[PDB]
Each structure stands twice: as structure tokens, then as C-alpha cells.
Design a protein around this nucleic acid. Structure first.
Ligand SMILES: [Mg+2]
Length: 755
RNA sequence: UGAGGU
């Protein structure tokens, strides 16, 4: 099965690069006049071949330092600083690549590059310019409100003894990425909110956590606060108005505007910012989401053609070859391996997946469930202001009949309406005896407001004070009839997994696998971190990826990603399993989440040493050490795989296909897995990094296991991208962090409360 | 917050 790999083999010439430093006698840092005067000076000296990267200049040939006064509108310095070969340092190679991509027309936003119209270089011909405009058009969203800039994310990587026919020195990764910006500035948004909200604190709540790009400097930041008592007229030590006039030459319109705060404390003027991504007021708009998804999702044929016509452009290739990087227009020839077909089973029948058919909602709608606890004393909460009595009764009735159809035996609930929708549960917690808090197994909730404060309040209060699981639906999302029945069926699906069982205190199980490649006597561990007070979530599964007994901890330092006491909470669960079953786990697979960018490897080794110390210290488990496997799986990658049929047509790789990365120079064995299926567009794979292994089975079985976990995600009826043990950990972390839980009641920890 | 891929 032939495949193509979006890494172009780049032949890099050992060009001698000279680094020059420039200074300007006047105290001007306008980011545009400095470049202009530098260009004037370079033209005066007549060095056409040059590269400008902020404070340094790249040249192919070393020439002496020239300083001269430029008569404009004034001493321009040149200082030789560095000269090493290009081949040795990938950092340089990336810098020249980025500067060239900036020259050809792209703008460096964050770490990516995005096309534009004004910041362009004239040496490009009109045909090439039109082709680039077509390939990377600035799409308009919402009829003049949102820009959708389409550009490339790039990286230069060294090869690891590549077979081809000669070994290539380096490869280049190219990914087409679309980024959304909003036309309106921050000041307009805050004024609009103040018009209707009329509450500064509520405005801070709505605006906090959002990302914004400043255009005068074009850098991205996160909203950490807003000072309303602070005005541009006030002074700060190096007034903000004078600071912008001198440093950036931008006229200020609002002298009484508040200033947004982004501490490492820096203050930014909202009139010169723009929100990042979809607006919160339109976050879940169906038509808006459909339009953006249509405009950013490229069919595999479309994406492949776009990439091929971009790379095959002889003019851009000449531009890059000038600076020693000869990109090969062809693509890496490659042969992949398809994992064995997987068969899903339930309590009713056995139905293999075979080719495609990677969604099985029909199976769950026409069959029963595996594990489901009887619902006896469950509560139903509906708003009494938006009172629909007979509608509430019929909702209870159809919920009951669907639960009966799903194999989950259910009892009539206690339909109760509240004005407050929050204080009823407070009264419930105040009186255990009257309300029988321990008797309630589940409290279904209906809130019509969708506000993120009430929802967080109910999910935190039901889990920190009572320990009764709840399920939330927005009343508007329920009133319509087109997707009401699917929504209620998915409600049954989530409730099955979200209510504790009486026997083993476990959640429900929806499907299993007929033949799991997961070896017997194995504890699958999935760990993720949500960084905000940052929380690390962990999930252990003694069975072959069926039930997860989650746990959480506070990462010692905010922003840091390293668990201090991983070994303690792992040996605790091993001891619990030994006490329960008098059995010792033969294998322990750790599917930790992260990016192995030379820091996560050290962190993972530190965690491994910590767990080794704890487990050797453990008297019970010292003499028999369970085998350990530390495997990194990654979500945010810019890699893709393209598939070729006999007729030479682009197609998504068949789901479950995988490959071993023999090109990137990494110390550990990497694999690329496409687990899922998407109807439209190329599907982004996942990066299985096998950092540490002691277990007998080869890494191929590990990739197969990860694919199995992918084909076991209970939240989505069909296959998913990230293996369930990792997404579950991420969901644990997101739930604990977002809802500010002080401590989850231990009884619910074994339940799948994160779904 | 019906939910995953985008
Ligand atoms: Mg949910």
C-alpha cells in the first residue's frame, strides 16, 4: 500500500553565512523606519543579496563593516558578529527559511507564516503572485467581519541515516494552516459589552482567557486582566500614549480607554488589538461554524494539489536555492502497513468494522449495552420560570423508554422545577435526611441559559459536596425536534457511563472488543496535564481499556509540566489492585501526553526515575517489579499522510494504517498513526513515541494497542483520533481545572464523570 | 453544556 509523506527532501549547501549587527544613532525603534533606513543604506552600498532578521543581517559573502550617515526625513552601523557554516546549525537553516518565506510575501504571525497583499516583494512575477493568491487566499468570514489568513507552518528537520539513491541531508515539513482574525478592535468590543452588560466584573469574566493579536507589533497574547482605573495618560517606567507615538507612531483616539493586562506586568491598549478566533457570542453558531469549516477544510486532492503547485513553482524554488536550500518538488516514496481489522461487540450481537464503516451509532441505537446500573432514585431538575410541565413528563417518558431500549433498567424520576436552578441543590445539601442525598444516584439537570457560571456551579457542587453525578442539557438544545431523539439517546449513552455501579463502584461499559491486542494482566495508564493552578489528570485501566479509575493532582508549578509524586499515586493504585485481587500486574503501559521537544523527554525520564524509586521502595512490589512502558502520544503535529490508489488519485489513508518514521533524527522509535476516518479532507495523524520499553512485545504491538484504545472512546460512537486513555486524562484535567473542584468525592472517582 | 472528528 503506497503512501506519500509530506516531508520534502531538501538538499542543503554548506553556504558560509555572515551575521552583521546594525545600530541607528537616533533613538528610533519604530519597527518600520529602521527597516526602511537599513534598506536605503544597503541599496547605497549595493548589496542586493541580504537578509534582515530584526537586529541582525544575513549575507552570503563576508564583507567589512561599513558605517555611513543616511540623509533622510542618522548613523547606520554594521558589525560582523558571527560566521559559521549553514549545514551544522538547524536553527540558522530555520531562520533563513523563515526570512525567505517572509520575503516571498508571507507575514510571521506567532511561529507561522501567512499570506498577505501589501508586504510583498516585487521580484515575484505576476503569474506566481496570482498562483500564490489562489493557493492562499485571504478568505472573508461573516461578510466583512473576520479574516481567514491561509499560510504555511514550516520546520527543517535533520535526517537519520535515510536510505534515499543517496541519503538526504535534511527534510522540510510544510503544512497549510488557516488562522482567523477579527476586524473589530478590542475597544469596540469592550464598549459594546459595556453598553449591554453595564458591569465591569462581568465584562472581565467574558473577556478573560481570550487571545488577542497586536498588529502594530503583530504578537499574540492572552487576556489576563483589564484595568479600568488606568488610562493612557498615566505613566509607566520603561505615558503609554507617548510610548506608542514614539515607539510605534500610532495616533490614539480614546484617551480615557481602559488598558488590558498581560503579565509575564505589561499593559496593552485595546484600540490596537483584535480578538483571536470565533467570538464568544458566536462561539457555537451553526452557520458560522459550517462556513469556517467549509473554508478551512481542504479535500485531500485539493490539499495535495495545493502543496504540489506551491512546491513546483520554479520561482519560489529559485528563491530558496539562492540561499542554499534546494527543495525537491517530489515527495518521499513510502510504504505503510495497515493494522488488522477490528470487530466491535456488545451485549446483543457481534458486528465487524471491516472497510470504512467507522461510525456505529446505528449499532447502539438498535442494540443493548454491556454494563448498566439500575437507576432507582434519580432526580430531574427543570427551570420553573421556563416551565413546561407536560413537556417535562413526556421527556421523562421518552428518556425512560430509550433507556429501556438501551438495556439500562430505569425507574420514574422526581420531576422538580426550580426558579433558581442553583439554590435547590444548596437546600438539598443542607438537609441530607429529608432529601436522602446518599440515596440519589443521578441528578439530571436542564438549564435554559447556557451560562458558564451556573453550569460550573452545579457540576462543582454536585461533585464536591454531595457526590451525586449530574448530566446537563440546554433547554434550547432540547426544544427543537430535528435532533431531539439523537440528543436523548446520547444522553442515555453518557448516563450509562456516568452513574456508579452498586457492585464494583464502576461506570457503565458501552462496547468491548472481540479480540483486544492488549495483553492480559496489563495496567493501561493515560496521563495528561491541563495548565491554566495547573492540574494533571491520570486514568488507570486494569481491564483492556473498558473502565477507567481516574485521579488528579496539582502540578507543583504553574506552566511547568512535571508530576512530582507520580510514583506515589501509581504504587497506591497497584497496592489497591493487589489488595482487591491478590494479583500483580505484569505490564504497566504509560501513554503520557506531550511533545518530545527535548524537554518532555527529560521530564519523562525524571518521572520514570521517580516511579522506579517509589516501586523499589515499595516492600510488597520490590521483589517483583512490574514491567514498564513509557510511550508518548502527540496531538498537535503539522504532519500529514497522503494515499495513492491504483489510478493515482489522492485519498485519506485507510483508518488504522500506521508507519514507522525512519527519517526524523530522534533517539526513540516514532510511529505515525491514522486511526480515524473523516468524510471530507485529510485527517491529521497522531505521533506515537516509544521513549522507554522493558516489556517483551515490540513497538508494533504498542501501536496496535494505541489504535485499539482509539477504537474504544466511549464519548464518540465511532473511532476517534486520540486514544481513549489520553483523551480521558485530558478530560479529567479540563474538568478539574475549568470547574475549580476542590476535591472530588472518592466514590465517583471510578466513574467516567468526564464524559 | 448531546458529542467526536474539523
Ligand atoms: Mg458531557
Amino acid at each position: 500500500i503506497d503512501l506519500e509523506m509530506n516531508l520534502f527532501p531538501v538538499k542543503i549547501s554548506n553556504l558560509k553565512i555572515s551575521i552583521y549587527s546594525w545600530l541607528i544613532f537616533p533613538k528610533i525603534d519604530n519597527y518600520k523606519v529602521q527597516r526602511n533606513i537599513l534598506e536605503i543604506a544597503l541599496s547605497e552600498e549595493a548589496l542586493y543579496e541580504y537578509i534582515i532578521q530584526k537586529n541582525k543581517i544575513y549575507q552570503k559573502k563576508r564583507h567589512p563593516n561599513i558605517k555611513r550617515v543616511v540623509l533622510f526625513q542618522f548613523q547606520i552601523e554594521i558589525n560582523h558578529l558571527e560566521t559559521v557554516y549553514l549545514l551544522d546549525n538547524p536553527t540558522l537553516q530555520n531562520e533563513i527559511f523563515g526570512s525567505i518565506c517572509q520575503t516571498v510575501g508571507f507575514e510571521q504571525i506567532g511561529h507561522n507564516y501567512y499570506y498577505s497583499a501589501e508586504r510583498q516583494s516585487s521580484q515575484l512575477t505576476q503569474s506566481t503572485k496570482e498562483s500564490l493568491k489562489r493557493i492562499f487566499p485571504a478568505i472573508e468570514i461573516d461578510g466583512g467581519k473576520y479574516y481567514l489568513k491561509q499560510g504555511l507552518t514550516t520546520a527543517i528537520h535533520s535526517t537519520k541515516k535515510n536510505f534515499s539513491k543517496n541519503a538526504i541531508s535534511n527534510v522540510v515539513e510544510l503544512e497549510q494552516t488557516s488562522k482567523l482574525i477579527q476586524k473589530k478592535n478590542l475597544l469596540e468590543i469592550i464598549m459594546d459589552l459595556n453598553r449591554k452588560v453595564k458591569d465591569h466584573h462581568k465584562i472581565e469574566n467574558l473577556l478573560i482567557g481570550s487571545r488577542f493579536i497586536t498588529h502594530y507589533n503583530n504578537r499574540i497574547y492572552t487576556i489576563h486582566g483589564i484595568a479600568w482605573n488606568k488610562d493612557p495618560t498615566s505613566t509607566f517606567q520603561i505615558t503609554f500614549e507617548e510610548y506608542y507615538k514614539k515607539n510605534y507612531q500610532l495616533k490614539i483616539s480614546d484617551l480615557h480607554q481602559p488598558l488590558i493586562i498581560y503579565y509575564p506586568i505589561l499593559y496593552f491598549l485595546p484600540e490596537f488589538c483584535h480578538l483571536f478566533g470565533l467570538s464568544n457570542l458566536d462561539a457555537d453558531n451553526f452557520r458560522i461554524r459550517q462556513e469556517i469549516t467549509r473554508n478551512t477544510q481542504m479535500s485531500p486532492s485539493d490539499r495535495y494539489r495545493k502543496l504540489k503547485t506551491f512546491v513546483e513553482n520554479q520561482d519560489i524554488l529559485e528563491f530558496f536555492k539562492v540561499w542554499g536550500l534546494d527543495i525537491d518538488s517530489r515527495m518521499i516514496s513510502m510504504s505503510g502497513i495497515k493494522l488488522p481489522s477490528l470487530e466491535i461487540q456488545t451485549q446483543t450481537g457481534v458486528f465487524p468494522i471491516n472497510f470504512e464503516q467507522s461510525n456505529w451509532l446505528s449499532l447502539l441505537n438498535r442494540s443493548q449495552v454491556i454494563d448498566a446500573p439500575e437507576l432507582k432514585k434519580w432526580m430531574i431538575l427543570y427551570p420553573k420560570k421556563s416551565m413546561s410541565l407536560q413537556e417535562a413528563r413526556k421527556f421523562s417518558n421518552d428518556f425512560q423508554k430509550i433507556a429501556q431500549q438501551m438495556g439500562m433498567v430505569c425507574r420514574p424520576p422526581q420531576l422538580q422545577g426550580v426558579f433558581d436552578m442553583t439554590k435547590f441543590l444548596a437546600i438539598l445539601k443542607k438537609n441530607p435526611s429529608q432529601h436522602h442525598i446518599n440515596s440519589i444516584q443521578l441528578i439530571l439537570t436542564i438549564t435554559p441559559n447556557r451560562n458558564k457560571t451556573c453550569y460550573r456551579k452545579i457540576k462543582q457542587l454536585c461533585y464536591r459536596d454531595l457526590g451525586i453525578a449530574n448530566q446537563n442539557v440546554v433547554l434550547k438544545n432540547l426544544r427543537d425536534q430535528k435532533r431531539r431523539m439523537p440528543i436523548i439517546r446520547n444522553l442515555v449513552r453518557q448516563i450509562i457511563c456516568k452513574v456508579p455501579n452498586f457492585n464494583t463502584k464502576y461506570g457503565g461499559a458501552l462496547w468491548k472488543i472481540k479480540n483486544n491486542s492488549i495483553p492480559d494482566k496489563t495496567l493501561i495508564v493515560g496521563i495528561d496535564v491541563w495548565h491554566g493552578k495547573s492540574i494533571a489528570g491520570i486514568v488507570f485501566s486494569t481491564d483492556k481499556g473498558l473502565h477507567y479509575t481516574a485521579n488528579y493532582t496539582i502540578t507543583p508549578r504553574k506552566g511547568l509540566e512535571f508530576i512530582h509524586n507520580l510514583g506515589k499515586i501509581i504504587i497506591t493504585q497497584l497496592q489497591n489492585h493487589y489488595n482487591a485481587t491478590r494479583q500483580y500486574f505484569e505490564n504497566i503501559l504509560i501513554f503520557r501526553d506531550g511533545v518530545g521537544n527535548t524537554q518532555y523527554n527529560k521530564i519523562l525520564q525524571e518521572e520514570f526515575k521517580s516511579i522506579q524509586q517509589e516501586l523499589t521502595n515499595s516492600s510488597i512490589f520490590s521483589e517483583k517489579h512490574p514491567k514498564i512502558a513509557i510511550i508518548l502520544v502527540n496531538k498537535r503535529i503539522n504532519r500529514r499522510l497522503f494515499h495513492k490508489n491504483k489510478q493515482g488519485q489522492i485519498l485519506n489513508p485507510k483508518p488504522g494504517t500506521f508507519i514507522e518514521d525512519q527519517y526524523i533524527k530522534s533517539e526513540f522509535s516514532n510511529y505515525y498513526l491514522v486511526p480515524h476516518f473523516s468524510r471530507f479532507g485529510t485527517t491529521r495523524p497522531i505521533h506515537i513515541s516509544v521513549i522507554y520499553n522493558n516489556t517483551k512485545y515490540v513497538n508494533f504491538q504498542f501501536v496496535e494497542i494505541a489504535n485499539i484504545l482509539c477504537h474504544l472512546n466511549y464519548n464518540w460512537a465511532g473511532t476517534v483520533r486520540i486514544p481513549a486513555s489520553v483523551e480521558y486524562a485530558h478530560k479529567v484535567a479540563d474538568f478539574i481545572g475549568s470547574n475549580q473542584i476542590t476535591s472530588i468525592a472518592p466514590e465517583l472517582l471510578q466513574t467516567q464523570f468526564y464524559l
